[PDB]
Amino acid sequence: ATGTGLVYVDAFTRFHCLWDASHPECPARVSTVMEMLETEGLLGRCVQVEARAVTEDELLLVHTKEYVELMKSTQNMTEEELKTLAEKYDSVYLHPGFFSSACLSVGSVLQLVDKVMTSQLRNGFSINRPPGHHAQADKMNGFCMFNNLAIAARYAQKRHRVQRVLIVDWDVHHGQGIQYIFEEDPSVLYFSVHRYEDGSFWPHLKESDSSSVGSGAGQGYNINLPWNKVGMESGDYITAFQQLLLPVAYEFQPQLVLVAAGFDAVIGDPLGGMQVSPECFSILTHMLKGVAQGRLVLALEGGYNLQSTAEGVCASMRSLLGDPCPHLPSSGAPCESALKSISKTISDLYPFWKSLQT
Ligand SMILES: CN(C)Cc1ccc(S(=O)(=O)n2ccc(/C=C/C(=O)NO)c2)cc1
Ligand SMILES: [K+]
Ligand SMILES: [K+]
Numbered sequence: 001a002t003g004t005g006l007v008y009v010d011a012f013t014r015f016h017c018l019w020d021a022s023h024p025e026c027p028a029r030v031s032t033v034m035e036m037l038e039t040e041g042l043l044g045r046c047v048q049v050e051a052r053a054v055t056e057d058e059l060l061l062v063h064t065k066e067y068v069e070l071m072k073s074t075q076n077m078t079e080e081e082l083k084t085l086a087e088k089y090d091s092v093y094l095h096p097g098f099f100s101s102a103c104l105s106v107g108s109v110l111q112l113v114d115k116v117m118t119s120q121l122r123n124g125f126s127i128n129r130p131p132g133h134h135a136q137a138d139k140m141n142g143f144c145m146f147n148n149l150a151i152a153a154r155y156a157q158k159r160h161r162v163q164r165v166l167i168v169d170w171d172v173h174h175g176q177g178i179q180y181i182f183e184e185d186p187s188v189l190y191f192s193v194h195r196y197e198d199g200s201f202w203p204h205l206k207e208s209d210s211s212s213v214g215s216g217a218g219q220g221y222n223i224n225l226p227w228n229k230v231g232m233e234s235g236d237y238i239t240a241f242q243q244l245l246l247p248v249a250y251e252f253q254p255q256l257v258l259v260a261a262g263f264d265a266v267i268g269d270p271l272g273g274m275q276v277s278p279e280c281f282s283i284l285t286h287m288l289k290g291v292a293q294g295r296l297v298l299a300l301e302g303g304y305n306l307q308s309t310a311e312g313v314c315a316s317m318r319s320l321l322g323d324p325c326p327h328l329p330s331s332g333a334p335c336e337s338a339l340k341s342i343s344k345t346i347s348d349l350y351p352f353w354k355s356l357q358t
């Protein structure tokens with residue numbers, strides 16, 4: 001009843017890049033996380049929750065039938081056919097076990113949502129791969145096949161009659177797939193903090209700027225915080241959460257919080273270029289527990305330094321378990337660049353949120 005759920009299955013390690021032995025999205029990502037959770041004594045304090053395969057109908061909450069059929073067919077393809085198809089998308093690989101593992105990756109999040117919404121667990125973390133936040137209605141993208149958290153949000157709405165879901169994406173990349181799926185939807189609030197650099201950082205989209213606030217019925221319910229300098233630190237994230245994200249979150253009154261919990265913003269990541277201490281994520285996780293009765297589910301997205309990502313997961317897990325907020329190595333003030341970005345996003349979202357009108 002008062003526990004923290006954890007999902008991990010060996011299938012999460014049974015796919016990898018056949019044609020690039022050094023691809024950063026690899027099985028060692030999750031096995032290293034699991035090893036550190038054990039050596040830190042955190043794994044044994046969690047409630048083990050079994051994974052399950054997403055159903056076709058659940059995938060169709062977000063993805064097209066044509067795309068689901070195509071992805072289902074990759075389990076029977078030759079390596080040459082997998083490479084030919086993978087190259088039709090931006091930055092993906094395929095593997096005979098990718099579809100099977102991707103279905104368990106979605107399902108792991110749904111399993112935690114079930115436990116949390118029925119008050120059987122307080123919160124949970126899925127240690128899943130492949131990641132999801134770049135996947136789109138009809139295409140793979142950015143190492144992702146299915147959009148784990150977008151499916152989970154719509155599942156929570158359909159299965160548990162949740163009205164409002166908050167998705168917080170602290171991966172260093174913009175989860176444009178999530179943004180696109182919910183762009184016109186005021187019932188799912190999407191917040192992303194990400195490296196941008198005027199579009200020079202992948203995925204190079206103007207829609208990743210803070211001027212993209214949602215459209216149609218969804219205006220105000222998409223919040224982008226783009227960083228335009230590398231080297232951001234814990235203080236930059238803490239400031240953004242205290243004065244932008246959490247004021248909006250309390251005004252929105254979500255009934256479930258889903259976190260796209262990537263750790264490629266952590267110190268040492270080979271792709272992210274940021275300097276956030278892993279301990280920062282204990283603090284960010286604590287803040288999110290005050291909303292939605294603490295009904296909080298984290299799911300692994302990116303993070304490609306094996307040690308840094310494990311440390312980030314552990315720091316988040318200590319907070320889910322209710323351990324004391326840890327002292328931070330560098331509790332410095334935010335930098336000028338971060339403050340410019342935060343001010344501009346606040347400016348763009350001001351008309352929609354009373355809690356930002358200060
Ligand atoms: C093939 N070798 C060189 C690895 C590689 C390095 C860089 C790029 S990239 O810059 O084009 N790119 C595309 C997607 C992402 C991020 C994914 C993510 O982490 N989401 O969380 C980054 C692609 C591939
Ligand atoms: K992000
Ligand atoms: K939205």
Ligand SMILES: [Zn+2]
Pocket residue numbers: 171172173262264301302303
């Ligand atoms: Zn990422």
